[PDB]
Amino acid sequence: SDVLDITADPTTAPQTERMMRINWKKWWQVFYTVVDYVNQIIQLMSKRSRSLNSAAFYYRV
């Protein structure tokens, strides 16, 4: 066999293959962190479901 022939680098865009892989790696990292932040916002917006009921029932002493 040999590594100088089996699908060499004629038009398989190998260099771009590795560069693209790195792009998805980072995009995913910032993506997981960005998505988490959004979840915190939602819960923060829906947290107003029974707030007044939490203080009235939590302050009944």
Residue 20 to residue 12: CA distance in whole angstroms: 13
Q: Return the amino acid letter for 56.
A: A
Find all residues with CB under 8 Å of 9, minimum gap 6, and list them: 15
CATH number at residue 9: 6.10.250.1600
Residue 47 to residue 41: CA distance in whole angstroms: 10
Helices (H), the chain: 14-46, 51-58
Find all residues with CB under 8 Å of 15, minimum gap 6, and list them: 9
Way it was determined = NMR
Residue 35 to residue 39: CA distance in whole angstroms: 6
Are 26 and 33 spatial neighbours (Cβ–Cβ below 8 Å)?
no
Location of structure tokens 């915190």: 40
Quote the tokens at residue 20. 């693209």
Domain that holds residue 29: 1-61
Q: Is 36 annotated as belonging to a binding site?
A: yes
